[PDB]
Ligand binder design. Sequence first.
Ligand SMILES: *[C@@H]1O[C@H](CO)[C@@H](O)[C@H](O)[C@H]1NC(C)=O
Ligand SMILES: *[C@@H]1O[C@H](CO)[C@@H](O)[C@H](O)[C@H]1NC(C)=O
Ligand SMILES: *[C@@H]1O[C@H](CO)[C@@H](O)[C@H](O)[C@H]1NC(C)=O
Length: 280
Amino acid sequence: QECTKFKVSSCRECIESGPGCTWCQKLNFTGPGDPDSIRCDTRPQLLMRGCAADDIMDPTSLAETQEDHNGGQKQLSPQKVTLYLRPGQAAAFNVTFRRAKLSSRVFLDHNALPDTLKVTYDSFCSNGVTHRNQPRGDCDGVQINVPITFQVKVTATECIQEQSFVIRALGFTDIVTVQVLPQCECRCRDQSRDRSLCHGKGFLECGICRCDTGYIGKNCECQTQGRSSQELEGSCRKDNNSIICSGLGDCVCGQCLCHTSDVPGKLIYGQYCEHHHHHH
Ligand SMILES: *[C@@H]1O[C@H](CO)[C@@H](O)[C@H](O)[C@H]1NC(C)=O
Ligand SMILES: *[C@@H]1O[C@H](CO)[C@@H](O)[C@H](O)[C@H]1NC(C)=O
Ligand SMILES: *[C@@H]1O[C@H](CO)[C@@H](O)[C@H](O)[C@H]1NC(C)=O
């Protein structure tokens, strides 16, 4: 899987970036030099970088199905389907058609949808014929008391608003009620059980500390006083066209904290972490 991203600053922005994108809510996951957007990546990349399973945010597209007491509907099942849709990721569910008297050929279709929703049908007919990824369900040679199966795939191009639509077999009063819901929000751990999180001077939002006014840093550890945020950054960059701590460190309250390496011999040092040694 692949994840294309650009300067993502929230869990939702990461999920909206593509079905292959996952978000790491792990505290202090972004080491010195690493921006918040590093938290957004493919799952095996985050796992490699030490993000645990309980810290990887990755909601998926899924289908929930329900049958009524079944005195209500004979030929189409299930009667109720709930879809949670993540943008770009298809949700699949099967609709069973059971012939009573009816028709030799059966078509499965849905009412008009917004352009943000894409629906295709696979047709697993009883006569051996199999259609895949069609705009409609289509099965000829349908016989009484031998069920046929249609696989419905629904894909949203965005975080859609909650809506419903129906799936019907042409020539029949039967209705499959389909409720669709967005799957774009992340269920992250909050601040409730620790007042020391973000030094108690900021809001914890999916691994990111949104520091209170007068506080900066990845953990809101630096109180700025009247010293401006840029003033403390100036002691961390060599010139005005350069990047803070040579992109290899964090500016911790006016001073660069350099990235430490596990690679033997590697040492990142200097006022701006500008010395990259291979033989230390
Ligand atoms: C996160 O890093 C900060 C260092 O600024 C540390 O004080 C805090 O205990 C860390 N939290 C963890 C490891 O959960
Ligand atoms: C639908 O049914 C077909 C054949 O019975 C099966 O191959 C497919 O996995 C089913 N789809 C789902 C989502 O269960
Ligand atoms: C220094 O660089 C910053 C870039 O964020 C810019 O906003 C600022 O105007 C620059 N200062 C001068 C004197 O060029």
